Amino acid sequence: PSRVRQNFHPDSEAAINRQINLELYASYVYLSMAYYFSRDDVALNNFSRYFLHQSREETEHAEKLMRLQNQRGGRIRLQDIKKPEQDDWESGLHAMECALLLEKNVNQSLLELHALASDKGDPHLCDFLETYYLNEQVKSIKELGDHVHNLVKMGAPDAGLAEYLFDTHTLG
Amino acid sequence: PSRVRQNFHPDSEAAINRQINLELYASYVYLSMAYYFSRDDVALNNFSRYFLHQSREETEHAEKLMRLQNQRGGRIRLQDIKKPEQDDWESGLHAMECALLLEKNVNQSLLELHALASDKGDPHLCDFLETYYLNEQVKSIKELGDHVHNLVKMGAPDAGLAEYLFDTHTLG
Amino acid sequence: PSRVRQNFHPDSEAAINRQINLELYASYVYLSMAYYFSRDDVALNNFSRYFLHQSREETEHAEKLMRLQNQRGGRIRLQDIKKPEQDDWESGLHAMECALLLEKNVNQSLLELHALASDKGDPHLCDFLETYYLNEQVKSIKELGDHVHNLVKMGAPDAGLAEYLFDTHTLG
Amino acid sequence: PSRVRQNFHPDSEAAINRQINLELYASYVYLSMAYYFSRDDVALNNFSRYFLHQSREETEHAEKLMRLQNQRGGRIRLQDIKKPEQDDWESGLHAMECALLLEKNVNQSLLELHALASDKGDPHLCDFLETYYLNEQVKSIKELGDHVHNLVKMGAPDAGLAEYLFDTHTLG
Numbered sequence: 001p002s003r004v005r006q007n008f009h010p011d012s013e014a015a016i017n018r019q020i021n022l023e024l025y026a027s028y029v030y031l032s033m034a035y036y037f038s039r040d041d042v043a044l045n046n047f048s049r050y051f052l053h054q055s056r057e058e059t060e061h062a063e064k065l066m067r068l069q070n071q072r073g074g075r076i077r078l079q080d081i082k083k084p085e086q087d088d089w090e091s092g093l094h095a096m097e098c099a100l101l102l103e104k105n106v107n108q109s110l111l112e113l114h115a116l117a118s119d120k121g122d123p124h125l126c127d128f129l130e131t132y133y134l135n136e137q138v139k140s141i142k143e144l145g146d147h148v149h150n151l152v153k154m155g156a157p158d159a160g161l162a163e164y165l166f167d168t169h170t171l172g
Numbered sequence: 173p174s175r176v177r178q179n180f181h182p183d184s185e186a187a188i189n190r191q192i193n194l195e196l197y198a199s200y201v202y203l204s205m206a207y208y209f210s211r212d213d214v215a216l217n218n219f220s221r222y223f224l225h226q227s228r229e230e231t232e233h234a235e236k237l238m239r240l241q242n243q244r245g246g247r248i249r250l251q252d253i254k255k256p257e258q259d260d261w262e263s264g265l266h267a268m269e270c271a272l273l274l275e276k277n278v279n280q281s282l283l284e285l286h287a288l289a290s291d292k293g294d295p296h297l298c299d300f301l302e303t304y305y306l307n308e309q310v311k312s313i314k315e316l317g318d319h320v321h322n323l324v325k326m327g328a329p330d331a332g333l334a335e336y337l338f339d340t341h342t343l344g
Numbered sequence: 345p346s347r348v349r350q351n352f353h354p355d356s357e358a359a360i361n362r363q364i365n366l367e368l369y370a371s372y373v374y375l376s377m378a379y380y381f382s383r384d385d386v387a388l389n390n391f392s393r394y395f396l397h398q399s400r401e402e403t404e405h406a407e408k409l410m411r412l413q414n415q416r417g418g419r420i421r422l423q424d425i426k427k428p429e430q431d432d433w434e435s436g437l438h439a440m441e442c443a444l445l446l447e448k449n450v451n452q453s454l455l456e457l458h459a460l461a462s463d464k465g466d467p468h469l470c471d472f473l474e475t476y477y478l479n480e481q482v483k484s485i486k487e488l489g490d491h492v493h494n495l496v497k498m499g500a501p502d503a504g505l506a507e508y509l510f511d512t513h514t515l516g
Numbered sequence: 517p518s519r520v521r522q523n524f525h526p527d528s529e530a531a532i533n534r535q536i537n538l539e540l541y542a543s544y545v546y547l548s549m550a551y552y553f554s555r556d557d558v559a560l561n562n563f564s565r566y567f568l569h570q571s572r573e574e575t576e577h578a579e580k581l582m583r584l585q586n587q588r589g590g591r592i593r594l595q596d597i598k599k600p601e602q603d604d605w606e607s608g609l610h611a612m613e614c615a616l617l618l619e620k621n622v623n624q625s626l627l628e629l630h631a632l633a634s635d636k637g638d639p640h641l642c643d644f645l646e647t648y649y650l651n652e653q654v655k656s657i658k659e660l661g662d663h664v665h666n667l668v669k670m671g672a673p674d675a676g677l678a679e680y681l682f683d684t685h686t687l688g
């Protein structure tokens with residue numbers, strides 16, 4: 001094994017590789033959303049900027065896991081990054097609802113990774129997830145929930161002013 | 173011929189004179205729109221400012237072509253600047269749609285000028301158009317498309333708040 | 345069609361979507377290389393930083409094409425980002441040689457895209473490629489060639505000091 | 517018991533005293549290494565500085581545990597600090613390999629302390645170890661692994677330039 005490896009189970013190593021792929025996938029979903037909002041027939045520039053920022057954060061999340069793999073003496077194994085489920089995200093509200101579902105799915109994967117790390121007696125990996133992932137996920141889910149609620153109440157997507165006003169006053 | 177003239181076809185010289193006239197015409201259309209929006213019964217001051225700025229940019233476009241004519245040893249031949257198709261532009265949305273059509277028409281003229289310059293083996297003129305005109309036109313058309321989409325979705329021109337809110341939040 | 349679309353052939357639109365995928369693939373290859381060099385049994389931190397920077401530049405290249413698609417009224421169609429050919433890049437020299445091959449392959453794709461844009465009489469797309477892609481590619485290929493030559497002459501990968509010294513004095 | 521003591525098992529108190537001794541021992545090992553590298557027949561001043569810094573960090577680690585003992589109402593019980601296994605550390609590579617082994621041994625002790633704290637339902641002590649010790653150890657082990665790899669590849673200790681160049685370019 002790696003001269004650095006200590007208390008690092010092969011199952012944890014493999015689960016970290018799966019998590020890297022999921023974070024890169026989330027990054028790709030958000031990149032797709034960002035450029036949907038800059039279409040000439042959508043043109044919600046602050047929705048675009050919001051999702052572009054989320055995309056870049058997800059790439060940061062992937063990289064921190066790649067660094068962890070190296071720090072612990074595991075070996076990064078990359079896989080294809082699957083394309084997002086849609087190119088046409090329909091509306092600001094629909095994109096927000098899809099982002100909320102994505103974040104809950106990523107959160108579930110992180111909770112499963114934490115349960116594995118616990119089962120394998122890996123407190124370093126548990127602390128890593130708690131310190132950098134789990135609260136970030138809760139904050140992200142709460143923010144998306146807030147945004148979905150306001151858009152629904154405002155009458156998105158059919159009320160003509162709703163996404164326009166939310167773009168300029170919440171995301172601006 | 174001019175002591176400076178080199179590789180500059182008379183057909184290119186004539187086409188540049190026609191393009192100067194078209195750019196001055198576009199400037200005049202936008203000047204007309206700017207002052208429509210400052211009527212007491214329209215009073216959308218940021219629509220006014222937006223089109224005034226576009227007017228000044230079109231005069232810049234005309235002048236750069238006039239400079240090119242001199243640089244290449246051609247002779248500027250000015251023609252009447254025709255009045256715009258309307259004085260009453262009806263609404264912010266209608267003005268935006270008319271501006272989009274104008275910009276596409278000017279773009280078509282520039283593409284024809286580029287095809288002529290190509291046919292005449294004039295890479296200086298091709299590069300001039302590519303460097304200063306063609307991307308500017310694509311950016312302008314995209315911006316106008318964005319604005320038309322938002323105004324349509326917001327319910328302009330009949331929805332009482334739409335042009336008012338777009339004036340203050342997009343064009344402000 | 346899109347209210348913005350003008351002189352933009354469907355074949356160009358499709359070729360731009362393929363180019364976006366290739367640029368994202370190049371970004372992924374370089375990300376893989378960056379993290380190879382931070383393995384405890386490789387530990388060439390400036391090779392790592394160099395390839396991380398190249399990765400981020402390739403994502404910028406993909407995004408500028410995504411923006412072009414929107415600007416011209418085409419529709420972005422994303423595909424899976426295939427995993428790199430290797431996770432273990434063997435040595436600093438091997439990674440540099442693989443990067444050089446990648447860049448030549450991406451360059452060939454851009455030259456084919458330029459030939460298509462020319463065939464379709466799309467001078468905006470030709471200028472876009474010339475302005476932002478073609479010289480960047482030539483500079484990148486030349487830089488990688490320089491690096492490969494120095495590493496070969498220094499005796500990489502087998503000469504114990506070669507990659508270490510190149511890491512600290514060229515890439516540092 | 518101490519008026520402050522709460523949820524603090526005597527076995528945890530004793531294990532913290534053993535950990536204090538181990539951290540002071542690690543500090544002493546690194547102090548020995550630092551002064552080996554300043555011998556006139558070794559004279560690798562940046563190896564010296566690197567290990568002196570590590571020595572001071574280990575004393576900080578001991579002190580934070582001494583503070584924890586007081587904070588929790590336990591009583592510090594100091595023991596002899598055993599001398600290091602060697603005074604003559606042989607080479608820069610050998611010292612690095614010995615430091616890596618030491619750090620893995622200290623890490624194993626901290627993981628055992630964390631397992632004890634878990635068994636005793638002491639989440640304060642678990643969090644203390646995770647927050648201040650476990651990631652520090654992983655970072656330290658990874659850094660030492662990196663250094664060992666580069667020194668081995670460079671040909672240390674027998675290749676005349678290897679430790680000299682690593683001293684000046686990595687540790688400088």
Ligand SMILES: [Cl-]
Nearest residue numbers: 005006007008
């Ligand atoms: Cl292990």
Ligand SMILES: [Cl-]
Nearest residue numbers: 078079080427
């Ligand atoms: Cl795969």
Ligand SMILES: [Cl-]
Nearest residue numbers: 079080081082
């Ligand atoms: Cl796959």
Ligand SMILES: [Cl-]
Nearest residue numbers: 118121122123
């Ligand atoms: Cl644990």
Ligand SMILES: [Cl-]
Nearest residue numbers: 146147150170
């Ligand atoms: Cl909100």
Ligand SMILES: [Cl-]
Nearest residue numbers: 148149152153
């Ligand atoms: Cl709700």
Ligand SMILES: [Cl-]
Nearest residue numbers: 177178179180
């Ligand atoms: Cl001539």
Ligand SMILES: [Cl-]
Nearest residue numbers: 250251252253
């Ligand atoms: Cl006339």
Ligand SMILES: [Cl-]
Nearest residue numbers: 251252253254
């Ligand atoms: Cl006339």
Ligand SMILES: [Cl-]
Nearest residue numbers: 290293294295
């Ligand atoms: Cl030519």
Ligand SMILES: [Cl-]
Nearest residue numbers: 043318319322
């Ligand atoms: Cl807009």
Ligand SMILES: [Cl-]
Nearest residue numbers: 041320321324
């Ligand atoms: Cl529309």
Ligand SMILES: [Cl-]
Nearest residue numbers: 349350351352
């Ligand atoms: Cl078209």
Ligand SMILES: [Cl-]
Nearest residue numbers: 083422423424
């Ligand atoms: Cl696909």
Ligand SMILES: [Cl-]
Nearest residue numbers: 423424425426
């Ligand atoms: Cl595919």
Ligand SMILES: [Cl-]
Nearest residue numbers: 462465466467
């Ligand atoms: Cl062309």
